[PDB]
Structure formats: structure tokens, C-alpha cells
Amino acid sequence: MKVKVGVNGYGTIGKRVAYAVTKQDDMELIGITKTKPDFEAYRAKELGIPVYAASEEFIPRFEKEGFEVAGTLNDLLEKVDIIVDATPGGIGAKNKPLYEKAGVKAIFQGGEKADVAEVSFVAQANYEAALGKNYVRVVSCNTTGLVRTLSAIREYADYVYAVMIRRAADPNDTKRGPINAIKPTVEVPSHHGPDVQTVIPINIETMAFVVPTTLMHVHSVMVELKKPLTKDDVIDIFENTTRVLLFEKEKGFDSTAQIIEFARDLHREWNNLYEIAVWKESINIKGNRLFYIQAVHQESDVIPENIDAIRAMFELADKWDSIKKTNKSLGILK
Amino acid sequence: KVKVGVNGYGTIGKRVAYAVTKQDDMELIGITKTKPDFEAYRAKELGIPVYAASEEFIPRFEKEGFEVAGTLNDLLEKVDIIVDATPGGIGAKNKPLYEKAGVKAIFQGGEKADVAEVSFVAQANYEAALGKNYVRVVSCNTTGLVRTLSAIREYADYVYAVMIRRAADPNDTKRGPINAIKPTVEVPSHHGPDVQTVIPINIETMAFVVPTTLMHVHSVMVELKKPLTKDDVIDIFENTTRVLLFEKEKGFDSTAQIIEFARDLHREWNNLYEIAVWKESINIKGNRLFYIQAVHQESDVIPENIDAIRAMFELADKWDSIKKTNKSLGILK
Amino acid sequence: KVKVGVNGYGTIGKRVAYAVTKQDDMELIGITKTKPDFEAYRAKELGIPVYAASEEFIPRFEKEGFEVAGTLNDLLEKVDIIVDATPGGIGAKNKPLYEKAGVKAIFQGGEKADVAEVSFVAQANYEAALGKNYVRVVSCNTTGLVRTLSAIREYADYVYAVMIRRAADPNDTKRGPINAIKPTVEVPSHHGPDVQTVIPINIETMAFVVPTTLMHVHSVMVELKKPLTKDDVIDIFENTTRVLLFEKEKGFDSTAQIIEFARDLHREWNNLYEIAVWKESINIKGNRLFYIQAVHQESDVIPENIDAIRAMFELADKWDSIKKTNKSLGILK
Amino acid sequence: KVKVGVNGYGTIGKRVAYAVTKQDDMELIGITKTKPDFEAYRAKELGIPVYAASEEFIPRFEKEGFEVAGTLNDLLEKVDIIVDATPGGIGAKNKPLYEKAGVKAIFQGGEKADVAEVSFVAQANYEAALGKNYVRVVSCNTTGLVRTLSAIREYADYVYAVMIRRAADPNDTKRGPINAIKPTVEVPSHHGPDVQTVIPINIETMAFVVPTTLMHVHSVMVELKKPLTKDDVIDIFENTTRVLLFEKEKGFDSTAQIIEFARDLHREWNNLYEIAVWKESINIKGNRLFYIQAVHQESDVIPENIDAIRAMFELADKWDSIKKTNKSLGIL
Numbered sequence A: 001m002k003v004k005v006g007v008n009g010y011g012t013i014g015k016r017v018a019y020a021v022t023k024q025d026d027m028e029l030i031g032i033t034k035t036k037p038d039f040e041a042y043r044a045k046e047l048g049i050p051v052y053a054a055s056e057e058f059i060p061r062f063e064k065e066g067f068e069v070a071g072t073l074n075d076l077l078e079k080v081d082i083i084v085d086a087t088p089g090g091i092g093a094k095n096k097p098l099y100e101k102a103g104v105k106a107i108f109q110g111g112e113k114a115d116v117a118e119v120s121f122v123a124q125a126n127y128e129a130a131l132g133k134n135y136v137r138v139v140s141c142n143t144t145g146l147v148r149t150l151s152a153i154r155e156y157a158d159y160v161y162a163v164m165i166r167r168a169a170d171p172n173d174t175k176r177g178p179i180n181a182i183k184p185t186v187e188v189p190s191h192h193g194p195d196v197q198t199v200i201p202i203n204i205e206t207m208a209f210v211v212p213t214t215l216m217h218v219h220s221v222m223v224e225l226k227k228p229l230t231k232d233d234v235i236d237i238f239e240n241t242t243r244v245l246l247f248e249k250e251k252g253f254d255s256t257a258q259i260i261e262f263a264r265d266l267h268r269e270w271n272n273l274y275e276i277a278v279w280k281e282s283i284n285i286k287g288n289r290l291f292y293i294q295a296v297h298q299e300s301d302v303i304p305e306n307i308d309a310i311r312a313m314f315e316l317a318d319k320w321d322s323i324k325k326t327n328k329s330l331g332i333l334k
Numbered sequence B, C: 001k002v003k004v005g006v007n008g009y010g011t012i013g014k015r016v017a018y019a020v021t022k023q024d025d026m027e028l029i030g031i032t033k034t035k036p037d038f039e040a041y042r043a044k045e046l047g048i049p050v051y052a053a054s055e056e057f058i059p060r061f062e063k064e065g066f067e068v069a070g071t072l073n074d075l076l077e078k079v080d081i082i083v084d085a086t087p088g089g090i091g092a093k094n095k096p097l098y099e100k101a102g103v104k105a106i107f108q109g110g111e112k113a114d115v116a117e118v119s120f121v122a123q124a125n126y127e128a129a130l131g132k133n134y135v136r137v138v139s140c141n142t143t144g145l146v147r148t149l150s151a152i153r154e155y156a157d158y159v160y161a162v163m164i165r166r167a168a169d170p171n172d173t174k175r176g177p178i179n180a181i182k183p184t185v186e187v188p189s190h191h192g193p194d195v196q197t198v199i200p201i202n203i204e205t206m207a208f209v210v211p212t213t214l215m216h217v218h219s220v221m222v223e224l225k226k227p228l229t230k231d232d233v234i235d236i237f238e239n240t241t242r243v244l245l246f247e248k249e250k251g252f253d254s255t256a257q258i259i260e261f262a263r264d265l266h267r268e269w270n271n272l273y274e275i276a277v278w279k280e281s282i283n284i285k286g287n288r289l290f291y292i293q294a295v296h297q298e299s300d301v302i303p304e305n306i307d308a309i310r311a312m313f314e315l316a317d318k319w320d321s322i323k324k325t326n327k328s329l330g331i332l333k
Numbered sequence D: 001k002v003k004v005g006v007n008g009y010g011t012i013g014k015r016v017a018y019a020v021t022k023q024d025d026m027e028l029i030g031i032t033k034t035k036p037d038f039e040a041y042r043a044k045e046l047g048i049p050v051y052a053a054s055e056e057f058i059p060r061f062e063k064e065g066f067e068v069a070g071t072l073n074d075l076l077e078k079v080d081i082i083v084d085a086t087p088g089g090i091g092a093k094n095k096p097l098y099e100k101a102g103v104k105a106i107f108q109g110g111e112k113a114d115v116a117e118v119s120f121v122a123q124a125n126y127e128a129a130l131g132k133n134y135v136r137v138v139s140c141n142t143t144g145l146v147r148t149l150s151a152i153r154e155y156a157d158y159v160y161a162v163m164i165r166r167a168a169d170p171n172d173t174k175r176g177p178i179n180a181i182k183p184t185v186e187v188p189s190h191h192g193p194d195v196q197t198v199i200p201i202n203i204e205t206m207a208f209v210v211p212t213t214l215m216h217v218h219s220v221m222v223e224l225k226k227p228l229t230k231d232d233v234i235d236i237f238e239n240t241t242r243v244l245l246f247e248k249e250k251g252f253d254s255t256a257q258i259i260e261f262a263r264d265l266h267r268e269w270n271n272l273y274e275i276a277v278w279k280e281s282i283n284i285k286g287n288r289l290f291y292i293q294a295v296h297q298e299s300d301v302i303p304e305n306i307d308a309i310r311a312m313f314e315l316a317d318k319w320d321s322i323k324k325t326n327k328s329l330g331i332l
Ligand SMILES: NC(=O)c1ccc[n+]([C@@H]2O[C@H](COP(=O)([O-])OP(=O)(O)OC[C@H]3O[C@@H](n4cnc5c(N)ncnc54)[C@H](O)[C@@H]3O)[C@@H](O)[C@H]2O)c1
Pocket: A008, A009, A010, A011, A012, A013, A014, A033, A034, A035, A036, A054, A086, A087, A088, A089, A090, A091, A109, A110, A111, A112, A139, A140, A141, A142, A170, A298, A299, A300, A302
């Protein structure tokens, strides 16, 4: 039978995960939650997806608009095997006891503390670590991107320094600045480094910044090599690493805008680029240091990771069988 | 099957090319490119033959080992009509070539009315293009203004609209302004006369450019000659094709959420072919009607392009073509 | 000299504080701050006694070793009037506090009209505030509308203006939208009625927010009731105080260049106190006048607050105060 | 008094002209323009003689009623030195004209290293320009890197910095990207070798362009050769000229507030000639120092051009010039 899934928090990550779940033949979307009957709630219903009020506390918002719901999250928790928690950072921790009391497994997003789960997850890097687990944290958008390429060359990395040039807000978020400024994270290192280390063992330090863009994040990566490695070896490795794609600035891929245009060209749902983008020409080796630039489509790179986490937690399949299945259902040729 | 070709596989061209492949009374023969960039490779991957725009550009493709199906001259030999989606002003420069070839041609809104025998917006003056050889589909903004204004023209004594336009399309990263409002000092703006090439209406417009890439926005004022109520306008717009009412009260706070609606639909390139009208903005004060609409400039003109082909070849009547095109693109009403 | 205090050392607050400092008939007793940030340190550095906005804010200061000259309650005891520059809606909550202290108070444009006895724009209705206790200087945009509209009021039968607004001030990095246009679905916009609290005219306005920080832009259309020519309007604007004409032909393509003119003048905080009007935008078509103007929202209500003070304490005639304020701020004409 | 002419009254050009009129050992002979736009008028209003950058441009001022004092050649004959502030690449082109006229010449950062005899940053290699006829003050980004790195040069055996640049200056409204991050796929980028043109140090850089106009920001990592504490670095910066420390805790959340500091100063054009360093960003982890700084690209190289003039004309000793220049601009 199919694993019964519920999604708490039908937000930017949540609705995309819900969609992914509907594309799996071994999983069934029991329902999702919303805190208000806005256009997204109407869309879920329009899609035939049962809409549950996130809590009894939000029920009046629905009743007010005369928007019928299938119940509250408490009702949904009684009919699922696992809940994908896609609520605001920090809110996952608050929901955990509700999940434990209901006896259902739970997946939390990167916005939560490592604290929250038994293990942090990135399919291609530590799938087996989540086997049978009940609580798994799919790391954040930037952490996932960093892990995908760093993990592929971990054996050659002695130390890595990465600068996160982050977008200020997702395309659908119009209530957040900065309109015109660069906001640095003065804490050195940013949360990214240690977060990476909750998935793969590696010496890493990171620094982050926020700039006025909504498209994708960009990573400036520097690795001190403790073992021989050439430029071609690196493109070869990246060329063969799943959920990673090389883009040539020479073909016209000048910025994150053209990278996203590639996804729009594929006619992807929400222009989702599940794959981490690496500028081919940026991969260089000077002395014993490797350098390269990558981009992350933060609205969707963790989508495939949530699906695979589900397979590992229920021991539905081995690592590569799940990744390939997840990949095919989302159009990731990898 | 009407054989179609697209000269200029850019923002409009690639979306019109796609629309053609969804019409079973048509056949996409090929598209042109001036260089083998990632968009040329995409066309090829889609199985669409790509021709070098001109004999001049051939070496660019040869250099990269990118095999082409030929050049625009070769293409012109294989089509009944060419859809020209080259930069504004370049379409006129191509007209002679199309003339000699003996093929019908459709130009986009960036060309002067000069370039064609008539300007077009299906739901407004479809019949005016029946059998023509050269037709120009009006700009993204003119199309948006026409669609809603045409629906209430019988009540319109005078119209004044302000165009708050995006500064550059999302895939255009070489255009400012990054932080400023650029006014068009030519007043009245050229949008009004452009609307008058499609429908008879007293109109005046003014335009501005702001740092956004998503959608243009229009502020419309209409002096009424006949009484009309808020509900009347809502009912008319709800029964007007290729127009959609969005409620700020349901979360549509800005053009970003409007586009989010198209992304939720999983629309190709997040295309919102339809003009978006904020339901709450529709107000009547005295003898004046006010409303706000938004236009997704990357795609509102593509269904107009497909209907123009049907009219020019007299393949179908106005509403039959419109209905068929809408279905092919997922436009409900 | 009139004893002046300013509650709210923010965007408007610190600029009005500086303006007060330039008057030979006024004295700045102090400014209020809710926390010891770099702006509080600046005020202290300038020698401006800094008062904690409230009792419940003194801890933040003590925690940082920042000595304050007391609280708002203390400051009110030492002034004849306080310029309230707190966020919209807070002014109303502060009025009772001011009345109790028995001091006169000036409110900004973010407050409702009823918060004061009269609304105000020096060059329009200076006299209306003579000897008053509570006056509301209308918003940055309302002020821009009044200056230009007041000068042609006698020919205006009806006016429709569209406000294309900056999303956030340069110093405000916590507010969106990054990429979108957000319309105000309420028709009319709050601007029309606020203008009517200063000058009697028929007007309806609509507003939008776009991603820029520099200045707001107004699209103005005026239905005429008396003969008027373009030339007449230019001349009228060339002769109305606090309004300057800019030529696109000289390089003023957008609001960035308008602001660049203020930077070139070395204006404090790049303040452009005067309303900017694109000369080339002025045009009359039939019975309607059109023009485009820009407002530097950070400083255009500054000179108005000063004049408000003189009218309220009846310190001088309308034009003596205006000329006196203008000279102190470098205001051109 | 040395006679200075500025060729290219642009963003850097008009600000340097101002700086010179603020000096007591020099006089602005005139500036040049290609068209009589509003900036050309402003220069005239300031009483600055305006020369048409070239004869072929005279008609432009003739079509208008704009009287000019002549061409670039007429200016070259009345100066001891000319500050070239033309677009990058044009400086090299204009060099043969400066030579045939026998006048010293300073080029800006956009030009290639070979356009001058030595690249310059006053507080780092002032002496290197003493007496020379051709010197290029390095770019905004390199000046910022040099000022801070130079101060800890003796403790760094390796530096890696990432350049997060503003896409267009406040007054440049015809340049993107409006919404995107544009990378420099050439890595390391030209910034490192540019720095190496002023001070001797092992550095590698990478750059990016983002949708902002206010300031560039540098993410800096330094491999230490000698022990160094956070308090050590902070003290060094507090004692390094043309460098200022800012506290996020005091409200400096981003480049916008940093700029706001300059506006509060009522600084001309809101010029922040000094490099900004976020005090809280200074941290040492292992044998590595990390810190973040921001550069106001419109004004950062201004004081540098004034000092280069003194070095080239040997008018003063390193620190005497810098103190004087700093004084004239209100640096502190
Ligand atoms: N690009 C991204 O925004 C991104 C990328 C990677 C990971 N994530 C992670 O996903 C999680 C959420 O991100 P998001 O961007 O989807 O947030 P979001 O703001 O888009 O939506 C989160 C959802 O939480 C819902 N919500 C609020 N309170 C709730 C409650 N009490 N119960 C249930 N739902 C509630 C809201 O309705 C909203 O739909 C975070 O941990 C975040 O770090 C986000």
C-alpha cells in the first residue's frame, strides 16, 4: 500500500511537496493545512486536495468566508502515517509534540534546529542515515545545494569556505525588503557551515549576505585540496552527480535569470529548478585550491529530498532506487 | 494545414511557436535564431527545426558545430505565413523579403501601424483581418486596454489610462532602471492612438517605467455616456473572454500574486494570457468608472497571434477561432 | 524665540529638527528617540538634547550608558509646541498628552484630518492656521499635489491624479515589494480627500506602490473650465514657490537624475524640498491639461512644518514666513 | 599652485574636481564634457570653465546656447596635470594626447595597469608615485581591499575575498540587472592582481553583481601567518586612516544605513570616502581572520587622486598630504 502523507503548512515548500507526493505511485496525499481561506487554499480544493484548518484557532477565518474544511490538523493527524511539516522556521519545533502524541512520523524543513530531528537529511549524501527513523530534518535550500556538490568531492576537500549570496524574498513575498541594499550576516560563520556538517563530515566555514533579488541564491565556493584533482575531473564529477546541472555562461547563461529561464523553458511546475546549477566556466583550480560558482532555486531544491526522506523512513526502498524514482516523477534526468 | 514559421525566437516568438504546435489546423515548420545560444538548443531539443535568421549569421552556428535547417530564405519557401517576432522596427525591415517570397506575415506591436493593412485584437476586430496578407498584433499594453475597453465601449465617452510598465522582462538582465521611475514625457502617450487602430474610442494615455519585471499595470478612468453600475461592470468583465477578475481580499495584493496564480496553474513559462482585473478596484463615482488591471506582457499577445492566422486564412469565424485557441492554451473563459 | 520640540526623530523628524535649527526665530529644545541607535548618537553629537520617547524606553538607554535629558513628559514642560513626527496613527494617541501638557502641536500627513483643527500647506492656506493650536501638515504626496494644483485651481473643473509611489525610503530596508506593483484598490485614494482639506477642488486619485526608493511620481490630468495654454502653465509654474521645472532634454530622464540635481546642490540628505515638474510633460489636449511631477517624500513637508509654526503663533504674514523659510533651507524659489 | 584639468566630468570626475577646488596647493583650470546636459550647466554655475571634450563635440554646444572655453586641447595647454575620469578603456586612448602636450596624467581604476608607471593608493604606496608623470589610481573595489589588507599585511600569507558589487550607480538608470545575480565566471577575477599592483600579498578574488546601487560589499577571509586577536584587528582598523568601523548593534543593518551615516553628515553627494567595516563581522577561527567591509564606489577613490597629484609633483610627504587631503574633505 501507499504511505499516507499529510502536509502541514501549504506554503512555498509545502504546496510543492504536496504536488510531489501526488506524483508518487507509492504515496497518497491525505490532505494539507492552511491558516486562512486565501487563493492558495481555494487552489488546493480546486485540485481535489482535502484542506484542513491548521488549527481550531483558524477555523473562524474559514467559517467567516464560508469555506468548508475537512477538519483541523488534529483530524488530519489521525489519518496519516507521516506529516511533512512545512511551517515557518521555529514552528516545526512547536508542532513536534503534537506529532509524537499522535504517533506519526514527521519531516521538518531546514528552518528548524538540528535539535528537532533524529537526523538531518540529503538523499544523495546520507539517505541510509534516515532508514527507519521517525523524525528527519531535510536541511535548508542553501545547505542542500552545498551538500550536493561538496559531498561529490568530499574526499578531495581539506577545507572549504563558501559565501552565500542570498535572495531577499521569494517571488510571492512582497512584504519583505531590502529594496536597495546589501545586508550582511555579521555572525561568522553563518548557520550554513554547521548545518552542512549535520549531513556530511567536512571542514567548512561560511558567510552569508542578502541582496535584492527573488530568483535564486548564488554560492561562491573555495576548497583547499588535500589530494590531487584537475579541472576536468571536477566537471566530470559534477556532470555525473544527480540533481546537479552544469550551465555554460557561453551559451548565454549570464545570471540566475537565464538559469531560471531554463526551468521556464522546460515548462516546469512553478518554474521549479530542482537541480543545483553550476557555471561550467567558473570551475577552476589555482595551486591547491578549487573554485566554482553555483546557484540554488530555493523554492524547490528541497522538494525531491522530502520525497526520498519518506522512502528511507518507511524503508520503502534502497537509496538509488528511491532517488531515481523521485527523479523520474519530477522530470529530473539527473 | 496552414504551414507556419517564426522569425525571431525571442520572448514572443518562442511562446507563439509553442502555441502553434498546439493548433491542429496548423503546422510549425521552423523558427529562426541569430546565434546558437541555449534557446537555439532548446528549439532543437523540442524537435523544432531552426534556421539561421540570415545568411550572415550562418558562421556563428558553424563555429559551434550547430547544424541548422537553413536560413530564413529557405524557411520562407516552406510556409504559408511567417510570424515576425523580431525587435520593434526590424519587422518593417523584413517586410520586403516577405513580400517577394509571397507569404502572408504577422508583425507584433513594436511596429508602426504602417507595417500592416490592419491592427488586431481577436475579440475586438477579428473580422477586420479576414483574408488579409499583412496584419500586426498590437502591443501587450494595447491588447490589455482593448480587451476591457472594448467590452464597455458603448458606455465610454472618454478614456484616460496610465500605464505603469515593467522595465524589463525577467530574462532581460541588461536593462535598467534599477532604482527610479522613468516618465514618458510625450503626452498624450502613444498607447492611445495605438488603441484607436483597433477600436473607435476617445482615449488618452500616459506611460511610466518602474523597476519591476513581472507585469504592467494600468490605472483606467472612463467618462460614461450611458449609466453603468459597479455590478454591471463586474458582470460584463466576467463574461468577457481572456479577462479574469482577481480579488485583493483573497490574497492578490500585487502583480506577484497574480503571476503566482499562473504559476499555480503550472502554465508554460508561467504565462497569464488573460488580462487581470482587480475586482475591488472597479468603482463608479459620478459619471466616471475607475478600475485597475494588470497585463502579463510576456504572453497576453500569443493567443491573438493564433487567431490572426485563422482570420488571415479565413479558416474559421471569430468566436470559433477564439474558442479553439482558448482551449489549446487552457484559457477557461 | 518659539520653543520647539520634536517627538519622533525619524525621516521627517530629524529633517524638521534641522530646519528648526536654521530659524532665527525658533529654538530646538529637544528631540525624542525610542532607543539609543546611531541616530540618537547623532542627535547627541549635534548637541541636541535627547529625550526618551517614554518612561518604558529609558531602560534601553541606561543599558547602553546613554544619558537622556529626560522623557517626553519632561520635554513637553519646556516647549511652546511639539512637532509630532511619529508613525501614522500614533499622532492621534499623542494628542491628549499634548493637550494635557497645554502645548501646541503639529501633526504629519499620516494622521487623520480630524486630529487637528486644520490641515496645511503654506503657499495654499497659510492664513487658515493663524493662531491655531493643532495643525496637520498633509502628506508628502498631498503636499506635492496642492502646490501645483493650487496654482491653477481657478482653471480646474476636475482633476484625476495617479500616484506612482516609492516602496520605502532609502534608509528603510525592512519593507517590500522587491519585484511587483501593488495597487490600492480603494477608489478614491486617500490623496484626493486630503487635498480637499487644504484647497477646494474636485479631485479623485488612485495610488500604486512600486519598487523604488527615490521619489514618488504623479500623473496629473486636469479638466479645464477656463481657457489655458501650455505656455500659460509653464509660466505659472515658473512662478510658484517650491516648484521647479526640469527638462528631460537636459538629461532629466527619471527620478534618479532629479535627485542627482539635489545631490549636486550638496543639499543636506540630498533634500529636494521643491516639487519637480517635467517641463516637457506639460501639454493641453482639447479641454484637458496633463503634466507629470515628482516628489522627494523625505523632505517636501519640511518647509511646511516651519511655516506652520509661524502661522500658529502668528509670527509673520504668509509670504514673509515662506521667504524666510525658503532662504534658511536654500529653497531656490 | 599646481594647475589641474579634469577630463571627463562624470561620477568620479565631478567629485574629484570638487576635491581639488577644496585644496590650497592646487587650482581647477577646467573640466570637460561631451554634451551640454544638466551637469555641464551645473559646472558652469559653479564658475568652473567647461571645455568641450573634443572639437567634434562643439556643434552640440552650438546647437544649444552653451558657451565653452574651448576643447580638450585648449585645456591641456593650461595645466600641469590632467585627471582622466573617462570610461574604462578611453584613458589609454587619451594618453597619447597628454604625452604630446607634455602634461602629467592620472587615470582611473578602469584602465589597464600598463597605462601608467605605477598603480596607486596613498596610504599603502604613496612614495611609489613620487615624481612620476603617469599614475593610475586603482578602482573603487581595489582601493577598499588595499586600505584594510595593507593594515594587516604582515599577518596574512593568503587572502581570498568575494566582491558583491552594485550593478549601477544611483544616477545610472539604463543598466541592469533589475532582478538577478550576475557572476563573474573568470576566477580568480581581476581584483586580486589589481591589488597586487599596489601591495605585495597572496590574494585571489571572485566577483558578482547584484541589484543594488548604494555600495559594494566585500566578504574577506585571511589566512594568518602570525597570531592575531579580534581586539587586535579592531584596534588596527580604528587606527587606519580612511577606514571606519560600524556596529550592526547600533543599527547599521546594511549598506543603506551605512550610507545614511554619510547623509547625516550632510556630506557632498552623500560621499562616504572611507571604507566601512562592520565591527561584529571581525572574527578569528583557527588561523583565519574573517571580516566584512563596504565601499561607496562613487567617492572612495576621490582622496586618492588628490594625494597622487602631490606625490607626482612631490609637493608633500606621504602623511602630510593625506592629513591635508583628509582635512579638506572632512574625513577625520
Ligand atoms: N525558499 C524558501 O522559503 C525555503 C527554502 C528551503 C527550506 N524552507 C523551509 O520550509 C519551511 C517553511 O518555508 P516556506 O517558505 O514554505 O514558509 P511560507 O511562509 O511560505 O509558508 C509556511 C506555511 O506555514 C503556514 N503556517 C503558519 N503558521 C502555521 C501553523 N501554526 N501551523 C501550520 N501552518 C502554519 C502558513 O500558512 C504558510 O503556508 C521553513 O523551515 C523554511 O526554512 C524554505
